[PDB]
């Protein structure tokens, strides 16, 4: 049965790898179904708990079944990823390390940059017997020795690459050899290359898509404790559909510019808040009753938050919210203050954001 | 310079090619220092001029500020420029750059913790995961597997990946804790 | 307009040599010919270094070519810059 | 059919004003400026709906007490006690509002979730009111171009 | 569109001669040949 079990594992691995994408789409469909059901929650009796309200009564069991199905399909998606996409990542990394070792001497001529997680993690794999496991060129170690062996030291390069100087020739020499049989426990556990498997697991853990699928796992599991955690899975439409990815790329294309625009808006609003806190404090009474005056610009931080919140969200600037300046010695000053705030913050900066989006489209 | 001139002016002399091959190393030492241009010669014919580019000049040239100035000058001369004034503007830029480079040469007269924490978290967590396989305690499970069972085989196949995912969770938590300690 | 200006600058810079102004295709008849011409034959950095050398080199020690370029640079005449011609065009028959 | 039904109800003749699009080419140009990116425009509305649903989930979980749209204290009118009601509230008077949902729901001053609701409102204004509508307008302009 | 019209006008004016319509490169085989042709040989002011 040692061979039959391996055959069955191979069949399951192939099935998951082949049906990986269908399971990923099924997960999104189940997420939309679960959220559609969750859209009929209400709060009730004070003790607070959320109860499903419906006329069918079968929707709550339907929600339980759908949650279980989502959790199972997500695990199947992780398995399918590990069967299908992980080999490509290992192949790419194991090829890049080989090229860096041979045509750059990245572990012979020089040493990793001392801040490259990939570099110091890949320093492990060069000593493994199971190297070019996925990459085709099975002669990488021999090529490296033929290139750098004479100048830097054949023995130490053999140690670095995990090959045998005095044992290789001894094997070709004349002695009796003994075969081995794989299904033995000692044989299989020795065949398991612990160092190479550790390096592979590290690469998989450092993979971004695997981390995203693990986050999907965690959200799906937490949804059982709190069903609204399934709403986070609606954030998967961006990577589910290409057409939505186009619209989102129209935004993310100039993301750095968009962040810097918000920072500049914050600085400009802070300057306006400084001016208001120095000269126009008495216009920030947001209290209707005269008994309790509510001063919004007595404190610097409070005034800044006021300007950020109801100064920017206002359609006409801060002057829409703070009181009218008529019949005051600073009337023209506050008029200029409000008009300039409207022009620079409401008109120009938001225009900069919209123009960035349009230019990204173009 | 002599050999480069001869080689460039005569490209198909096998004797010169062999002689250059003999002269390979010396011609490789001076390659950064040998500078060559083409000028509209006095005899109404294009000629090649060879000279010595100093090491200090090259370093000051590939200083980043000089590169920014070069990009700005190229942008200016391309957008608002005429082919009549292009070579005058280029010489003005050359003069200004040479002066600033000489002044710079005059004045210039003589995280790892995060990476280590993340890597140690990887090593420790993966070794913790692999210990359950390395303990040789899978003898009772091997005995339970000696009799073929569909539920057993599917459970083992799923449990391997479940354990990998749990190990990833522990690794992420350890990295978060380490980064929190480092920042605080 | 700013984006178009940047794109125009890069397109001109990558399609024609800065000094001679010859199109990239003529040099590209030889593989990598344009980058060879713009990085070895006609290089603005090389011209700047030549001006530095000419300025810092003594008048008496100037060679004939250096004295020619020095005189024309002093009189501000820029005909020594290859305009519309290059080594490859001038020696096209014999070199190729 | 519309012309015949107009005899029973004369306002059915108003549907025939929808024929100007196929009557004039010049109006067809302006309308093609919209229909050129119709799929993108529909997907933008769908993304807006999803984002608003996420915001509604957050509000229904943490900020339910800010949705009392009743002036008299005798009868409290809770707009986010029900998930569907809160979602419709956010779609209608959260999007049609010029400054986001914070223009409609009550002020958060002097509360333990003050900064959380400030972030909630500012992010709603930035993503829904500012960016997504900018995406729609940019799609129209790009279609013109 | 207005900006593109201005740019098209300037590009055409600088790339081909107004009268003969020959491209600038043919004249530019001689250095400054295009400006010599468009300012001395074929000049619209001269025709006026
Ligand atoms: N006469 C010329 N001198 C130099 N480069 C030229 C010339 N004519 C065309 N080019 C082209 O201009 C390109 C720009 O060169 P360069 O590498 O300096 O610019 P970059 O990409 O902005 O980066 P950097 O200045 O940092 O190296 C070159 O790759 C070259 O193909
Ligand atoms: N037949 C032509 N006659 C004149 N100019 C021509 C002709 N063909 C092409 N051109 C180009 O048109 C360009 C425009 O000439 P011109 O100097 O009159 O225009 P400008 O830059 O608008 O300024 P201004 O009219 O004030 O001198 C010239 O520099 C020339 O290169
Ligand atoms: Zn050139
Ligand atoms: Zn003409």
From Swiss-Prot, chain B:
Record's subcellular location: Sarcoplasmic reticulum membrane
Q: How is it modified after translation?
A: Channel activity is modulated by phosphorylation. Phosphorylation is increased in failing heart, leading to calcium leaks and increased cytoplasmic Ca(2+) levels.
Stated induction or repression of this protein's expression:
By TGFB1.
Expressed in which tissues:
Detected in heart muscle (at protein level). Heart muscle, brain (cerebellum and hippocampus) and placenta.
Q: Which disease is it linked to?
A: Ventricular tachycardia, catecholaminergic polymorphic, 1, with or without atrial dysfunction and/or dilated cardiomyopathy: An arrhythmogenic disorder characterized by stress-induced, bidirectional ventricular tachycardia that may degenerate into cardiac arrest and cause sudden death. Patients present with recurrent syncope, seizures, or sudden death after physical activity or emotional stress. CPVT1 inheritance is autosomal dominant. Ventricular arrhythmias due to cardiac ryanodine receptor calcium release deficiency syndrome: An autosomal dominant arrhythmogenic disorder characterized by syncope, cardiac arrest and/or sudden unexpected death, often in association with physical exertion or acute emotional stress. Patients who survive manifest polymorphic ventricular tachycardia and ventricular fibrillation. Unlike typical catecholaminergic ventricular tachycardia, arrhythmias are not reproducible on exercise stress testing or adrenaline challenge.
Instruction: State the oligomer form and interacting partners.
Output: Homotetramer. Can also form heterotetramers with RYR1 and RYR3. Interacts with FKBP1A and FKBP1B; these interactions may stabilize the channel in its closed state and prevent Ca(2+) leaks. Interacts with CALM and S100A1; these interactions regulate channel activity. Identified in a complex composed of RYR2, FKBP1B, PKA catalytic subunit, PRKAR2A, AKAP6, and the protein phosphatases PP2A and PP1. Interacts directly with FKBP1B, PKA, PP1 and PP2A. Interacts with SELENON. In cardiac muscles, identified in a complex, composed of FSD2, CMYA5 and RYR2.
Organism domain of life: Eukaryota
Source organism per entry reads Homo sapiens (Human)
Which gene does this sequence derive from? RYR2
Q: Which family does it belong to?
A: Belongs to the ryanodine receptor (TC 1.A.3.1) family. RYR2 subfamily.
- Know the name of this protein? Ryanodine receptor 2
* Domain note: The calcium release channel activity resides in the C-terminal region while the remaining part of the protein resides in the cytoplasm.
Residue ranges crossing the lipid bilayer per the database entry: 156-176
Instruction: Please give the range of the full-length protein represented by this chain.
Output: 4100 to 4310 of 4967
Swiss-Prot record, chain C:
Provide the disulphide bond pattern.
Answer: none
- What is the reported tissue distribution? Detected in heart muscle (at protein level). Heart muscle, brain (cerebellum and hippocampus) and placenta.
Top-level taxon? Eukaryota
Question: What is the annotated localization of this protein?
Answer: Sarcoplasmic reticulum membrane
Q: How is it modified after translation?
A: Channel activity is modulated by phosphorylation. Phosphorylation is increased in failing heart, leading to calcium leaks and increased cytoplasmic Ca(2+) levels.
Connected disease? Ventricular tachycardia, catecholaminergic polymorphic, 1, with or without atrial dysfunction and/or dilated cardiomyopathy: An arrhythmogenic disorder characterized by stress-induced, bidirectional ventricular tachycardia that may degenerate into cardiac arrest and cause sudden death. Patients present with recurrent syncope, seizures, or sudden death after physical activity or emotional stress. CPVT1 inheritance is autosomal dominant. Ventricular arrhythmias due to cardiac ryanodine receptor calcium release deficiency syndrome: An autosomal dominant arrhythmogenic disorder characterized by syncope, cardiac arrest and/or sudden unexpected death, often in association with physical exertion or acute emotional stress. Patients who survive manifest polymorphic ventricular tachycardia and ventricular fibrillation. Unlike typical catecholaminergic ventricular tachycardia, arrhythmias are not reproducible on exercise stress testing or adrenaline challenge.
Q: How does it assemble?
A: Homotetramer. Can also form heterotetramers with RYR1 and RYR3. Interacts with FKBP1A and FKBP1B; these interactions may stabilize the channel in its closed state and prevent Ca(2+) leaks. Interacts with CALM and S100A1; these interactions regulate channel activity. Identified in a complex composed of RYR2, FKBP1B, PKA catalytic subunit, PRKAR2A, AKAP6, and the protein phosphatases PP2A and PP1. Interacts directly with FKBP1B, PKA, PP1 and PP2A. Interacts with SELENON. In cardiac muscles, identified in a complex, composed of FSD2, CMYA5 and RYR2.
Q: Which family does it belong to?
A: Belongs to the ryanodine receptor (TC 1.A.3.1) family. RYR2 subfamily.
Note on domains (UniProt): The calcium release channel activity resides in the C-terminal region while the remaining part of the protein resides in the cytoplasm.
Q: What is this protein called?
A: Ryanodine receptor 2
Which organism encodes this protein? Answer: Homo sapiens
This chain is encoded by the gene named: RYR2
């Amino acid at each position: 049965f040692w061979k039959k079990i391996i055959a069955y594992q191979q069949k399951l691995l192939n099935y998951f790898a082949r049906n990986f994408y269908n399971m990923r789409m099924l997960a999104l469909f189940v997420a939309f179904a679960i959220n559609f059901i969750l859209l009929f929650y209400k709060v009730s009796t004070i003790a607070v708990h959320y109860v499903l309200e419906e006329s069918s009564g079968y929707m709550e069991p339907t929600l339980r079944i759908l949650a279980i199905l989502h959790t199972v399909i997500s695990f199947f998606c992780i398995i399918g990823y590990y069967c299908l996409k992980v080999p490509l990542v290992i192949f790419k990394r194991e090829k890049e390390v080989a090229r860096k070792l041979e045509f750059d001497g990245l572990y012979i001529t020089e040493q990793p940059s001392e801040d490259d997680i990939k570099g110091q993690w890949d320093r492990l794999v060069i000593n493994t017997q199971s190297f070019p496991n996925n990459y085709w060129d099975k002669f990488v170690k021999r090529k490296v020795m033929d290139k750098y062996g004479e100048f830097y030291g054949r023995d130490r390069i053999s140690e670095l690459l995990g090959m045998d100087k005095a044992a290789l020739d001894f094997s070709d020499a004349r002695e009796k050899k003994k075969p081995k049989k794989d299904s033995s426990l000692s044989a299989v556990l020795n065949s398991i290359d612990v160092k190479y498997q550790m390096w592979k697991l590290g690469v998989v853990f450092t993979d971004n898509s695997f981390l995203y699928l693990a986050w999907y796992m965690t959200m799906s599991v937490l949804g059982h404790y709190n069903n609204f955690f399934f709403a986070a899975h609606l954030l998967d439409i961006a990577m589910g559909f290409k057409t939505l990815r186009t619209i989102l790329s129209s935004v993310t294309h100039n993301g750095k510019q968009l962040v810097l625009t918000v920072g500049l808006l914050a600085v400009v609003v802070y300057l306006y808040t400084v001016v208001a806190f120095n000269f126009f404090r008495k216009f920030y009474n947001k209290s209707e009753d005269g008994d309790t005056p509510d001063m919004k610009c007595d404190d610097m931080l409070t005034c800044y938050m006021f300007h950020m919140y109801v100064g920017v969200r206002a359609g006409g600037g801060i002057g829409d919210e703070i009181e009218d300046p008529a019949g005051d010695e600073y009337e023209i000053y506050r008029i200029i203050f409000d008009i300039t705030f409207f022009f620079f913050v409401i008109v120009i900066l938001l225009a900069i954001i919209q123009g960035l989006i349009i230019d990204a489209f173009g | 310079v002599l050999l480069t001139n001869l080689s460039e002016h005569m490209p198909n002399d096998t004797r010169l090619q062999t002689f250059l091959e003999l002269a390979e190393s010396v011609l490789n030492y001076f390659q950064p220092f040998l500078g060559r241009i083409e000028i509209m010669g006095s005899a109404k014919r294009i000629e090649r001029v060879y000279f010595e580019i100093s090491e200090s000049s090259r370093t000051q040239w590939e200083k980043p500020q000089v590169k920014e100035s070069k990009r700005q000058f190229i942008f200016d001369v391309v957008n608002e420029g005429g082919e009549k004034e292009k070579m005058e503007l280029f010489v003005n830029f050359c003069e200004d750059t040479i002066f600033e480079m000489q002044l710079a040469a005059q004045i210039s007269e003589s995280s790892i913790l995060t990476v280590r924490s993340a890597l140690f978290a990887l090593r420790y967590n993966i070794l913790t995961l692999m210990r359950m396989l390395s303990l040789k305690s899978l003898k009772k499970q091997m005995k339970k597997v000696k009799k073929m069972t569909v539920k057993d085989m599917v459970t083992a196949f799923f449990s391997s990946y479940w354990s990998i995912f749990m190990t990833l969770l522990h690794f992420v938590a350890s990295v978060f804790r380490g980064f929190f300690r480092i920042i605080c | 307009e700013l984006r178009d200006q940047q794109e125009q600058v890069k397109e001109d810079m990558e399609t024609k040599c800065f000094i001679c102004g010859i199109g990239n295709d003529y040099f590209d008849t030889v593989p990598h010919g344009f980058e060879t011409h713009t990085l070895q034959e006609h290089n603005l950095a090389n011209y700047l270094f030549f001006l530095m050398y000419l300025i810092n080199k003594d008048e008496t020690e100037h060679t004939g070519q250096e004295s020619y370029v020095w005189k024309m640079y002093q009189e501000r005449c820029w005909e020594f810059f290859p305009a519309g011609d290059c080594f490859r065009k001038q020696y096209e028959d014999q070199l190729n």
